[PDB]
């Protein structure tokens, strides 16, 4: 009862058969989630659309992922991944930002319990690749405690609304290193031209930052 089910795709698949010619079947993709981090998806196939609905939703609850959420409202860090030809770039966002994402990602995020996130889907917009690509990326996000344990350092959050106050979000459970993390004068991290073009204001699009209903 704690889980809600959402449909992501309903397709009519047509199979050519040796004796009966073209037959019509239904392939359905549905996602399930309880709104508290536990969510999954499953494909359903049947001749009837309502039998497919039963199969997918019942199967989905046996293949649940657990998704880590920062402060139970957003992701822990920016996630950029490709699944086959579908690229998904997700950005950690503060409270009140809402879900400004592909409509399917919005639906999936409500099942997981993510309230604030930006996502951009490029390349092939294949619902299945998008769904399993999204769950693969959300299931491999490192939390702040995992980062602290891995590096044996404090994770300190600086918020502009709180000024210079250092907020320790995670501390290592084991011993605490004494040697500061090396300060590379210039990081060799790969950047997204879309993010840089935006930060500089060179990104002008009539479709970006449009007024939309609360999501």
């Amino acid at each position: 009862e704690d889980f809600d089910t959402r449909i992501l795709e309903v397709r009519n698949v047509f199979t050519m058969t040796a004796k009966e010619g073209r037959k019509k079947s239904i392939r359905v993709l549905v996602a399930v989630g309880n709104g508290k981090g536990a969510a999954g998806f499953s494909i359903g196939k049947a001749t009837d659309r309502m039998d497919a609905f039963r199969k997918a939703k019942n199967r989905a609850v046996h293949h649940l992922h657990y998704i880590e959420r920062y402060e139970d409202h957003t992701i822990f860090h920016d996630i950029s991944l490709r699944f086959k030809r579908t690229h998904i770039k997700m950005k950690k966002q503060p409270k009140g930002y809402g879900l400004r994402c592909h409509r399917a990602i919005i639906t999936i995020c409500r099942l997981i319990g993510i309230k604030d996130m930006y996502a951009k889907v490029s390349g092939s917009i294949n619902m299945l690749s998008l769904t399993q690509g999204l769950f693969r990326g959300l299931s491999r996000q490192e939390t702040h405690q995992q980062l602290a344990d891995k590096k044996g350092l404090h994770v300190v959050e600086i918020r502009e609304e709180c000024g210079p106050l250092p907020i320790v979000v995670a501390s290592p459970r084991g011993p605490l290193r004494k040697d500061p993390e090396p300060e590379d004068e210039v990081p060799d991290v790969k950047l997204d031209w879309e993010d840089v073009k935006t930060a500089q204001g060179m990104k002008r699009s009539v479709w970006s930052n449009l007024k939309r209903a609360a999501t």
Partner: protein, 295 residues
């Protein structure tokens, strides 16, 4: 001969700085405003202690007390009386020197009246004209209605005294009559309802103490400091009181009895305090709990 201290004396500022307190969680409370995604740093125990030290320094700047000024004297100076212009205009002209690099209290702002008199703008006209041509963020040309008595009681009921003082600081000059009237009405609402904790770890606590000490009404704040186990602050309050009222019954009693520490509060409670009974009782209770902890 012997001058009584000012609000900005290093001795008084030090006493009021400690009585105020520094709380980094309150001083840097999260603001309700347009938000950005936060940044994260990996820090050692030393890098964290340094970042916390820097935050304390940034807080001591944010807690810098505004100077307490006396009410400004009305401006009534006539520069010229050109009677030949009498009755030639129906509306008066306000002339403001907008030369950029001049302090606002040195800018000549004059008014040509329909009578022909060229006079210096009044304090109210000056602050209004400076806002017109040198608009300051948070200040309005017309006085906001929040400062009416009916609307301040609403803000006091919500325990928003610090917002009232932030609003008053932004709208009125520190020596204005509106600035002083609002601060005094706010300090009195705190004294009547015992809301002294609303101003701790803010830049407005010292001005509030300065008001109570000069008006000889520290009994309420002194009780609040004892009930919170802040005897170091409560003892400094009685010392600041003696420093600013040297020829007083309590200051002499402390000299005759060479009182120190908690003894000052007992001397003050008997001689000058109005609620002397409630202080001794409140002080007695504190000494008991301290003995229970010792034993």
């Amino acid at each position: 001969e012997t001058k009584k201290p000012t609000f900005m004396d290093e001795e008084v500022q030090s006493i009021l700085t400690k009585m105020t307190g520094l709380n980094l969680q309150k001083t840097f409370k999260p603001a309700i405003q347009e938000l950005k995604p936060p940044t994260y740093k990996l820090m050692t125990q030393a890098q964290l202690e340094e970042a916390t030290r820097q935050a304390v320094e940034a807080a001591k700047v944010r807690l810098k007390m505004p100077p307490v000024l006396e009410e400004r004297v009305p401006i009534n100076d006539v520069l010229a009386e050109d009677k030949i212009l009498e009755g030639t205009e129906t509306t008066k002209y306000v002339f403001t020197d907008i030369s950029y690099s001049i302090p606002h209290r040195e800018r000549f702002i004059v008014v040509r009246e329909p009578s022909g008199t060229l006079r210096k703008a009044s304090w109210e006209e000056r602050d209004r004209m400076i806002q017109v041509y040198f608009p300051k963020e948070g200040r309005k040309i017309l006085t906001p209605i929040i400062f009416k008595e009916e609307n301040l009681r609403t803000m006091y009921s919500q325990d928003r005294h610090v917002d009232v003082l932030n609003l008053c600081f932004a709208q009125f000059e520190p020596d204005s009559t509106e600035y002083i009237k609002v601060h005094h009405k706010t300090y009195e609402d705190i004294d009547k309802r015992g809301k002294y904790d609303l101003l701790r770890s803010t830049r407005y606590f010292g001005g509030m103490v300065w008001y109570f000490v000069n008006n000889k009404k520290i009994d309420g704040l002194l009780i609040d400091q004892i009930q919170r186990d802040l005897i170091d602050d409560a003892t400094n309050l009685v010392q600041l009181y003696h420093v600013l009222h040297p020829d007083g019954q309590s200051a002499q009693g402390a000299k005759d009895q060479a009182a120190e520490g908690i003894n000052l509060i007992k001397v003050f409670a008997k001689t000058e305090a109005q609620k002397g009974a409630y202080i001794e009782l409140t002080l007695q209770t504190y000494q008991e709990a301290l003995s229970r902890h010792s034993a």
